Amino acid sequence: PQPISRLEQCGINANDVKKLEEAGYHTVEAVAYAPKKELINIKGISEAKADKILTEAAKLVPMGFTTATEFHQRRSEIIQITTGSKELDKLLQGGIETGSITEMFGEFRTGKTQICHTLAVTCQLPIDRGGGEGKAMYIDTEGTFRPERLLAVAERYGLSGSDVLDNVAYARGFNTDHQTQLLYQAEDMMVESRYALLIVDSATALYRTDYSGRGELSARQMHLARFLRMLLRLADEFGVAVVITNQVVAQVDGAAMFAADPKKPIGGNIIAHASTTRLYLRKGRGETRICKIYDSPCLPEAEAMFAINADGVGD
Amino acid sequence: PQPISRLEQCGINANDVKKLEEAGYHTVEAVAYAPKKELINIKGISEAKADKILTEAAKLVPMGFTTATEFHQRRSEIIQITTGSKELDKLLQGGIETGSITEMFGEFRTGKTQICHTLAVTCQLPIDRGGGEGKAMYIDTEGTFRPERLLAVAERYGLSGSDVLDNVAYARGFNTDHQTQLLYQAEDMMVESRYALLIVDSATALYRTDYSGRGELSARQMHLARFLRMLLRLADEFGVAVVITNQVVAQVDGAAMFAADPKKPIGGNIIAHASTTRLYLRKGRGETRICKIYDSPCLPEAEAMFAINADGVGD
Amino acid sequence: PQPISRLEQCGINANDVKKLEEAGYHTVEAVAYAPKKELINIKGISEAKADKILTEAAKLVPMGFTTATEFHQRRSEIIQITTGSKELDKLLQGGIETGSITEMFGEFRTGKTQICHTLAVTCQLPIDRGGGEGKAMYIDTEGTFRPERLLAVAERYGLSGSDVLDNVAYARGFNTDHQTQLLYQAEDMMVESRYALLIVDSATALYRTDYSGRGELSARQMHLARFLRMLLRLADEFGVAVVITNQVVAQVDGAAMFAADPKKPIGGNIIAHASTTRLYLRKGRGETRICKIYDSPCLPEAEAMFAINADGVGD
Ligand SMILES: Nc1ncnc2c1ncn2[C@@H]1O[C@H](COP(=O)(O)OP(=O)(O)NP(=O)(O)O)[C@@H](O)[C@H]1O
Numbered sequence: 016p017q018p019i020s021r022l023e024q025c026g027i028n029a030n031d032v033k034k035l036e037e038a039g040y041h042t043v044e045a046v047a048y049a050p051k052k053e054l055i056n057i058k059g060i061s062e063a064k065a066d067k068i069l070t071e072a073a074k075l076v077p078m079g080f081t082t083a084t085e086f087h088q089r090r091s092e093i094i095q096i097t098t099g100s101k102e103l104d105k106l107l108q109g110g111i112e113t114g115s116i117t118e119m120f121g122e123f124r125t126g127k128t129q130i131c132h133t134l135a136v137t138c139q140l141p142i143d144r145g146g147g148e149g150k151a152m153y154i155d156t157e158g159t160f161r162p163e164r165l166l167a168v169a170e171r172y173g174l175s176g177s178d179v180l181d182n183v184a185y186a187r188g189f190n191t192d193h194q195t196q197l198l199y200q201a202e203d204m205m206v207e208s209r210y211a212l213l214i215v216d217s218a219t220a221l222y223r224t225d226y227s228g229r230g231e232l233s234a235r236q237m238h239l240a241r242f243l244r245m246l247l248r249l250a251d252e253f254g255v256a257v258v259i260t261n262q263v264v265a266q267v268d269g270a271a272m273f274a275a276d277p278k279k280p281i282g283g284n285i286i287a288h289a290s291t292t293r294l295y296l297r298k299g300r301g302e303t304r305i306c307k308i309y310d311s312p313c314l315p316e317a318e319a320m321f322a323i324n325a326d327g328v329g330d
Numbered sequence: 331p332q333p334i335s336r337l338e339q340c341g342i343n344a345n346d347v348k349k350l351e352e353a354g355y356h357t358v359e360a361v362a363y364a365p366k367k368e369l370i371n372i373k374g375i376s377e378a379k380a381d382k383i384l385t386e387a388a389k390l391v392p393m394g395f396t397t398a399t400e401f402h403q404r405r406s407e408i409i410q411i412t413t414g415s416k417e418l419d420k421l422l423q424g425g426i427e428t429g430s431i432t433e434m435f436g437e438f439r440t441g442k443t444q445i446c447h448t449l450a451v452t453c454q455l456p457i458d459r460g461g462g463e464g465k466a467m468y469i470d471t472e473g474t475f476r477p478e479r480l481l482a483v484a485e486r487y488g489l490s491g492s493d494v495l496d497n498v499a500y501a502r503g504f505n506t507d508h509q510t511q512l513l514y515q516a517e518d519m520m521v522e523s524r525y526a527l528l529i530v531d532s533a534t535a536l537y538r539t540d541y542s543g544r545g546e547l548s549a550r551q552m553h554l555a556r557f558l559r560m561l562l563r564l565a566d567e568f569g570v571a572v573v574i575t576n577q578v579v580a581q582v583d584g585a586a587m588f589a590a591d592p593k594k595p596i597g598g599n600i601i602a603h604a605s606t607t608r609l610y611l612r613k614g615r616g617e618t619r620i621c622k623i624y625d626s627p628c629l630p631e632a633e634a635m636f637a638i639n640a641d642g643v644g645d
Numbered sequence: 646p647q648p649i650s651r652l653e654q655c656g657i658n659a660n661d662v663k664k665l666e667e668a669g670y671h672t673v674e675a676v677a678y679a680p681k682k683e684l685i686n687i688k689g690i691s692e693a694k695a696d697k698i699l700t701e702a703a704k705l706v707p708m709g710f711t712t713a714t715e716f717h718q719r720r721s722e723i724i725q726i727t728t729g730s731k732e733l734d735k736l737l738q739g740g741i742e743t744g745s746i747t748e749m750f751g752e753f754r755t756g757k758t759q760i761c762h763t764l765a766v767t768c769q770l771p772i773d774r775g776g777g778e779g780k781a782m783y784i785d786t787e788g789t790f791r792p793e794r795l796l797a798v799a800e801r802y803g804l805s806g807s808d809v810l811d812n813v814a815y816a817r818g819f820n821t822d823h824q825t826q827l828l829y830q831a832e833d834m835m836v837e838s839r840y841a842l843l844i845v846d847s848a849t850a851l852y853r854t855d856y857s858g859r860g861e862l863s864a865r866q867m868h869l870a871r872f873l874r875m876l877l878r879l880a881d882e883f884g885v886a887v888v889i890t891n892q893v894v895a896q897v898d899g900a901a902m903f904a905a906d907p908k909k910p911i912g913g914n915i916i917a918h919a920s921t922t923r924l925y926l927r928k929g930r931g932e933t934r935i936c937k938i939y940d941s942p943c944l945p946e947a948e949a950m951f952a953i954n955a956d957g958v959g960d
Pocket residue numbers: 121122123124125126127128129130302323324325326327602603604605606624625626627628629630631
């Protein structure tokens with residue numbers, strides 16, 4: 016979370032720092048995580064200044080061989096924010112892991128925003144209470160925030176509804192460029208504080224609605240790859256749990272029977288590879304719904320029944 | 331909800347603003363919520379000028395990060411329509427939301443046009459403690475307008491006649507192109523007049539013969555996705571309760587119904603997702619059509635009967 | 646395998662040695678394998694114009710007529726690293742042998758990087774067993790370096806998890822120069838001990854035109870050619886095995902093609918002839934995935950049945 020200004024005092028001229036700040040770079044770790052040509056292609060001064068600023072940034076940040084001994088040791092501090100249901104939390108090995116993209120998707124009324132609200136609430140719980148003790152974020156691309164649901168959720172854990180609402184940041188995503196710019200703002204908006212959770216509800220709704228077509232608007236895949244890359248950059252530099260959610264699309268080929276039903280996630284492989292944890296939700300009966308692990312390099316696929324009660328997710 | 335009154339003189343000349351006005355955007359908010367692609371695609375618009383007017387429109391509005399307490403301060407004045415049935419007020423919980431898209435659907439003879447006309451009449455009057463004297467927009471394609479049951483129904487409301495008749499705007503599209511293309515004229519029309527509701531009735535009835543068959547499906551679902559995203563933008567801009575009613579299609583597969591719900595709503599995952607609440611309707615006995623909460627971000631799952639008779643909705 | 650330490654202060658002094666070490670080439674064979682244009686173009690201080698010593702130092706390179714019997718006997722008892730599944734080891738006569746490039750690709754659910762961790766863990770197994778008896782490297786820009794993979798696979802073959810912890814030199818970084826520099830000090834940690842594996846797993850992404858229209862160059866093709874160039878030069882010099890993983894891109898068969906195999910590799914012709922062994926991963930019913938070969942000089946087309954469980958990969 017070290018800012019750009021920390022680079023300035025270590026033998027860096029103010030022009031480069033101010034250009035970096037204006038361009039949307041707020042963390043020296045992010046610069047050390049940035050491609051050389053990307054930093055070069057800003058104004059023109061950084062073109063000849065890259066060979067010095069990159070070394071100045073890397074002299075502090077350890078980017079050599081973070082051996083698996085150190086990686087496992089730093090894996091201990093991973094919060095694994097709770098889910099809301101004991102079944103979901105246990106099936107997720109203690110809950111939703113932090114520092115990674117943990118996209119979930121499903122058909123309508125699968126509880127995507129319900130789990131989003133429960134996460135935005137329970138990430139503020141103390142560490143022993145199933146949370147990161149952090150301040151939540153929420154980037155909704157449709158407006159279904161429903162903060163009254165947050166208040167109702169806040170009652171179950173005994174946390175006061177007075178501060179769980181002021182401990183949540185909100186932002187309306189209106190297009191793809193708005194998504195990227197809001198993420199840029201969130202970069203310097205969580206830099207000073209401990210934020211344990213980042214929400215983007217329907218990270219792909221605007222991609223699907225705006226970049227519509229084949230070929231005519233299939234630069235969307237490069238755009239979405241860039242966006243998911245920036246989410247992973249944030250989740251690495253800050254340790255924040257990115258919990259973007261995704262919609263689904265139908266299989267219309269001659270067959271009717273398919274793996275995981277005709278309903279398969281949208282985005283293609285740009286979003287499938289750049290998504291470490293992937294949960295597929297379906298509809299059961301009444302409140303009950305079933306969760307299945309679609310893609311995760313650490314979990315076995317199974318079923319966990321979570322019911323959308325009067326206070327979020329639980330049983 | 332602020333029309334184009336400052337874009338024409340925001341340093342940027344009024345000429346490219348005229349191009350924007352004729353190309354589809356008639357307000358500051360729609361451009362601010364717009365991405366760069368839709369405007370660079372416009373003829374006569376350069377990339378740099380597009381970036382300039384995008385930054386201008388963005389800095390015009392907040393489009394940023396606000397605390398959820400401010401969102402509640404915005405939520406306390408949600409102008410929900412006054413639903414005609416008391417038990418319906420106890421299930422819809424105040425009527426119909428302000429930022430939303432309602433999808434009340436069901437088979438033939440299930441009371442989906444009376445709700446359209448009663449929701450058109452209501453909120454034009456400051457009764458039931460419902461302020462915000464607004465209008466209605468009956469945008470019909472199936473042929474369920476009937477502007478005589480419309481005027482002869484303001485009896486329980488008791489609001490005289492022909493003022494509702496001139497207080498409702500009506501357009502009768504026939505193809506899916508018309509229903510989407512008239513939304514621009516709708517917004518350009520009530521950008522200056524306060525509207526509390528926009529009804530497009532059987533909007534998904536057009537996506538049944540207009541783009542007919544498999545192999546013509548992808549274009550149809552793309553068109554519907556753009557139509558619904560445009561609804562989202564209108565609702566998030568003007569803050570109105572926009573209403574769609576959905577047809578049904580049988581499921582001739584013979585499986586996964588167990589003699590229950592042998593009918594799915596027309597439209598696929600394109601519509602199931604971009605709809606805040608959806609209300610299943612099934613016809614009971616005599617004139618008591620029944621209801622159910624298919625989904626809603628906050629409203630709980632609850633079956634609830636209702637009834638129909640002359641003058642429209644009721645107990 | 647290692648520099649013979651004879652050219653220091655002999656034709657090229659230690660100062661010029663550092664001048665050439667600026668751009669890698671620490672083993673004498675590595676310097677000899679470099680074009681003279683690059684060696685004469687390093688820095689103003691590092692002109693090194695009179696640098697023909699690398700050619701007269703032909704005693705180090707194995708150039709010359711060497712009996713094919715020596716090659717046959719050296720690779721007859723070659724080190725093969727098993728995948729943990731007998732059927733996988735039966736589709737292939739090892740084919741993982743140390744000293745070539747092993748590329749895999751497939752859909753997301755099939756376990757592209759699942760077997761990479763397994764091979765890295767079992768790479769420590771003795772020579773007569775299915776491993777190189779070393780501390781295999783690893784680089785993962787994707788970030789999917791989950792530790793339970795390392796521990797469970799070690800437990801599968803009856804091994805301590807602490808050994809595999811410090812037996813893998815993980816690294817991480819988004820920028821491409823990061824990967825290149827990692828491969829630059831890859832020699833500097835090649836020198837001291839024996840590992841016989843240099844997995845690089847994920848390939849770094851890049852950012853392209855965000856506001857400036859659509860379509861662009863990348864130079865990724867020559868970057869990937871150079872990257873695989875260091876890969877195979879390291880493999881040949883050190884007698885080590887190089888492993889990469891490849892994303893899958895579909896829609897290539899959308900031009901009136903029967904689309905039997907629409908999932909095409911990324912990388913064009915650069916990935917094709919810079920690679921010797923290529924493998925295809927196909928998703929099966931649940932955990933029952935099937936392994937395939939695109940093209941190998943000494944392999945037919947074979948399929949095997951393999952599964953993934955809690956303790957690694959196996960049936
Ligand atoms: N208080 C409550 N009591 C019982 N059930 C509830 C309650 N609140 C919500 N639900 C149910 O839980 C569902 C969750 O839906 P939601 O979380 O919006 O799904 P989604 O897939 O995110 N929505 P969309 O993608 O727009 O179709 C609701 O639609 C109701 O069916």
